Design a protein. Structure first.
Lengths: 112, 36, 12, 312, 231, 281
């Protein structure tokens, strides 16, 4: 390598470090698909992004990556865990998504 | 509008014309590929 | 004699 | 017909290619990518809210632009190289200047006026850009003023694909209604219309000569239409694969026809004869994007697994 | 963008001194910084270098040990701490910025120097340093390196600078072929390895000064002797 | 008659079964997996260690039957070294896998080291190097004093103290380190999953069928297959043992049990995992 390729690699490493930091920052974020109006609310050191939303192809094309779908993935009601409930509702959503995240972590580590 | 025969012939002529500088059908020597 | 030391033996 | 003429044509043979590169700097699904005209730098949009400029030869990260909205469906790279763009469920299109004097990347302009989301966008120049929306229409833009200059309404369902001609004078785009229409940038009229499919058209591309285009539908079919005969010339289906088609791309000569499916693969079709010659299988999840360089050297393939590979 | 240095003056031999530079108008933390000095009668001489993030530092073999370079990012300040001064270090010190990615231009902006007074290596030659010039005329500058500056990746690292009288140098051409922003299109550069030249179409006003050539392939960066043009 | 036929039979049977299982797992991981990962790296490392242990078994199989070592000296010194290396690499690799699962489940947001593939590969190399270091006395003191068998450790003059030190050191480290680490890691994993699943819903199935059964399987298999060997060695170093050939039968079975554990490891670690059941069928 030359003196400038090494500097470019240093810049790339710095970008990698910053991307890792940003990814770790976003590891405490949750997208509560609701099925546009967007409700963001935090609870017990955890944020929640609720999205309120006519076609089946639209939903599959841009929302299959959500964590736990809430209808008033997983099911929260007010692999495919289903939970029901009716100040307490927010805590119930918190518990449901925490369970979903733990099960997803276990699936990632192969123990499931 | 033109008959399907002439359009098909034009497509064949085009595809055969440029089927020597297409680095996805013909192999690319490792000494020329930039993705070793 | 080395009856059984570690996965081995010598005529004991 | 096409098959009768192509019967005597010798086949291609099995197509084998491997992942020369693997770019790992994204943490969510990748929805779009686009090559720079130099075919070395490429831009990638991801649902992490990030937009990374990649040095393809060394896998070096040149830039890392943060986005305001993480719901993005499109990329674009200006032919000059000074600007990129992106759009999605924000219904706007943001333009970024890559070469500033302060040493950073800044947003040059935000474009507003589309009523529905943004499906595709492609620069014509440093100042002109054509976008597609779910409003069943398209438009032309002026980035030094930020106002629309034309509008191309007439479709019935959502427009999901877009493909500029090699001269960028003509323009074809597919819709949720199974039809494709040829638009004129300088006149704003539908020159031609085409039908034959039965489901939403997810991808559309242009033949290297501009006299045809490929329509990849959501019912596992592709067809080769023409602008002079005004009819389909071929079909590309197989009973084994019955799912959607998510991307389409020709090659430098038009003899080969890449594609992408929800079945975690990219079946390498053939153009003149429908017989399938090739398969690419290197992705954990399905493939969203599929691009071929201008020099025909490589094929980049982003996917829902947050990685994108280079195949040659 | 502004680069302005402070400190300097008169110092007795053996007495430590500190020079500082303040930067404003650009992202300071994304640029590498250099120090360059020139004697009152001689040319530029690279002193020391500190990269972005402070992860890499380089020094010359004539000031190693005595001098030190460091940067403060939150305060946008660059420092040069020097000790055990001698009569060989009487020169005006410049600060330069550089950014390295695919296609960037390093050595863009130079600061205004501060005068300090005290009571293996690639060699280049620019022996031609006195050429008459006439308006509307074309002249060619020369620069030769000891070894080949072309690299395996296709880049040849030769940089050109112009120092107008009473001012700091400015970048003309980077990597022997690419023209810098804000430079008129009458400046051209070409030449294979170990044989390079700079071309000017019309020698109008503001084209008179001293031209230097520099190499960026091995971390000790060597400048040329210089070429002066006069009316 | 009975002892002179069964022992090589069972030795070769376990060898072939383990080789088949590990080869199948390695092939599946190497071909039918594309996306980069770390759990796959761990599984591949463990399968490779088990395969090399199986490759080491046959020399002991041959020596423990004819009461003779018809191989020589160089490969006698090599086989013991490679066998010890493979054994301790397997033990430490499954310990590191347990710790990695603990980090994944109980302490997320450690992507700087947990999910960074270079970190996992460096950890694998480090455990292999540490294994090679642990076996160093075996390599140094190996010798062949006599032609007839004697493919053992050429002990120095204080043979008794040296032997006791070797056995105590190896048993202590390579049994009661990994065992305790595994117990703590998997106990905390199961406690966390139990509490999390119980705090939300009146759920039970996931708390019961997987986190209990798999964890109990790994722990019970490890202890059951590595306890007889070490207890027998410890008893031998302290108390004398009978010398009649009739009782020589059980020693070979005790020595062969850990190889059965190495055979059984892949069939659960790399087959009773979701990423393979759902990723291949």
């Amino acid at each position: 390598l030359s003196a400038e390729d090494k500097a470019a690699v240093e810049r790339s490493k710095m970008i990698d470090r910053n991307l890792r930091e940003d990814g770790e920052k976003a590891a405490r974020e949750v997208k509560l698909l609701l099925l546009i109006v967007e409700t963001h609310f935090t609870f017990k050191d955890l944020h929640f992004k609720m999205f309120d939303v006519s076609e089946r192809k639209k939903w599959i094309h841009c929302f299959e990556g959500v964590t736990a779908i809430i209808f008033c993935t997983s099911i929260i009601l007010f692999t495919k865990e289903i939970y029901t409930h009716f100040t307490k509702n927010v805590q119930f959503v918190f518990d449901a998504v925490t369970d979903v995240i733990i099960k997803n972590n276990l699936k990632d580590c192969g123990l499931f | 509008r033109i008959k399907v025969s002439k359009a098909a012939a034009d497509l064949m002529a085009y595809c055969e014309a440029h089927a020597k500088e297409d680095p996805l059908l013909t192999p690319v020597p490792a000494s020329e590929n930039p993705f070793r | 004699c080395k009856n059984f030391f570690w996965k081995t033996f010598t005529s004991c | 017909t096409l098959s009768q003429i192509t019967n005597n044509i010798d086949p291609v043979g099995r197509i084998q290619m491997r992942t020369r590169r693997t770019l790992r700097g994204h943490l969510a699904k990748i929805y779009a990518m686009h090559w720079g005209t130099d075919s070395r730098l490429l831009v990638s949009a991801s649902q992490d809210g990030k937009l990374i400029i990649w040095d393809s030869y060394t896998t070096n990260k040149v830039h890392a632009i943060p986005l305001r909205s993480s719901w993005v469906m499109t990329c674009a790279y200006a032919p000059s190289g000074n600007y990129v763009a992106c759009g999605g469920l924000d219904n706007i299109c943001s333009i970024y200047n890559l070469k500033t004097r302060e040493g950073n990347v800044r947003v040059s302009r935000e474009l507003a006026g589309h009523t529905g989301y943004l499906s595709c966008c492609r620069f014509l120049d440093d100042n002109q850009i054509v976008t597609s929306s779910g409003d069943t229409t398209c438009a032309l833009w002026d980035i030094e003023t930020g106002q629309q200059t034309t509008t191309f309404t007439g479709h019935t369902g959502d427009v999901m694909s877009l493909s500029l001609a090699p001269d960028t004078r003509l323009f074809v785009s597919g819709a949720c209604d199974a039809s494709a229409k040829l638009w004129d940038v300088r006149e704003g009229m539908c020159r031609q219309t085409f039908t034959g499919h039965e489901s939403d058209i997810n991808a559309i591309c242009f033949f290297p000569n501009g006299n045809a285009f490929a329509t990849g539908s959501d019912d596992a079919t592709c067809r080769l239409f023409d602008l002079r005969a005004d009819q389909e010339l071929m079909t590309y289906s197989h009973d084994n694969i019955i799912c959607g088609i998510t991307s389409v791309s020709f090659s430098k000569s038009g003899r080969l026809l890449l594609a992408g499916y929800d079945d975690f693969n990219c079946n390498v079709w053939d153009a003149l004869k429908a017989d399938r010659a090739g398969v690419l299988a290197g992705h954990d999840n399905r493939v969203s994007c599929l691009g071929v360089t201008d020099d025909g050297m490589a094929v980049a393939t982003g996917s829902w697994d947050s990685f994108l590979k280079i195949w040659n | 963008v502004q680069l302005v240095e402070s400190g300097g003056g008169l110092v007795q031999p053996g007495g430590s001194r500190k020079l500082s530079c303040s930067a404003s108008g650009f992202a300071f933390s994304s640029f590498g910084m250099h120090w360059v000095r020139q004697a009152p009668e001689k040319g530029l001489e690279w002193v020391a270098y500190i990269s972005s993030g402070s992860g890499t530092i380089y020094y010359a073999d004539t000031v190693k040990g005595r001098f030190t370079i460091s940067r403060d990012d939150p305060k946008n300040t660059l420092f040069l701490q020097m000790t055990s001064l001698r009569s060989e270090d009487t020169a005006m010190y410049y600060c330069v910025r550089s950014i390295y990615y695919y296609g960037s231009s390093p050595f863009d902006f130079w600061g205004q120097g501060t005068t300090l007074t005290v009571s293996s290596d690639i060699v280049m030659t620019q022996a031609t340093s006195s050429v008459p010039v006439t308006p509307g005329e074309s002249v060619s500058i020369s620069c030769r390196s000891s070894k080949s500056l072309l690299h395996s990746n296709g880049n040849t690292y030769l940089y050109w600078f112009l120092q107008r009288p009473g001012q700091s140098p400015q970048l003309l051409i980077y990597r022997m072929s690419n023209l810098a922003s804000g430079v008129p299109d009458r400046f051209s550069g070409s030449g294979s390895g170990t044989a390079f030249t700079l071309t000017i179409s019309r020698l109008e006003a503001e084209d008179v000064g001293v031209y230097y050539c520099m190499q960026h392939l091995e971390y000790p960066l060597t400048f040329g002797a210089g070429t002066k043009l006069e009316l | 008659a009975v002892s002179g036929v069964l022992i090589p039979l069972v030795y070769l049977v376990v060898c072939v079964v383990g080789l088949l299982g590990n080869s199948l797992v390695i092939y599946v991981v190497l071909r039918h997996t594309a996306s980069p990962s770390v759990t796959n790296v761990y599984i591949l490392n463990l399968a490779l260690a088990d395969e090399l242990f199986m490759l080491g078994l046959p020399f002991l199989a041959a020596q423990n039957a004819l009461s003779y070592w018809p191989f020589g000296s160089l490969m006698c010194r090599l086989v013991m070294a490679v066998d010890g290396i493979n054994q301790f690499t397997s033990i430490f690799c499954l310990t590191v896998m347990s710790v990695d699962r603990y980090l994944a489940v109980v302490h997320p947001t450690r992507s700087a080291r947990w999910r960074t593939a270079p970190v996992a590969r460096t950890v694998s190399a480090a455990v292999w190097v540490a294994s090679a270091v642990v076996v160093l006395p075996v390599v140094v003191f190996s010798g062949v004093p006599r032609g007839m068998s004697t493919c053992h450790m050429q002990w120095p003059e204080p043979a008794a103290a040296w032997r006791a030190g070797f056995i105590i050191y190896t048993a202590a480290l390579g049994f009661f380190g990994p065992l305790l680490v595994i117990c703590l890691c998997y106990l905390l994993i199961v406690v966390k999953v139990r509490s999390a699943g119980r705090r939300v819903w009146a759920r039970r199935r996931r708390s019961e069928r997987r986190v209990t059964r798999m964890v109990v399987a790994v722990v019970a298999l490890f202890v059951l297959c590595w306890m007889p060997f070490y207890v027998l060695n410890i008893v031998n170093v302290v108390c004398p043992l009978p010398e009649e050939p009739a009782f020589f039968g059980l020693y070979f079975l005790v020595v062969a049990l850990p190889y059965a554990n190495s055979c059984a490891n892949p069939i659960l670690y790399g087959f009773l995992s979701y990423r393979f059941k759902q990723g291949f069928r």
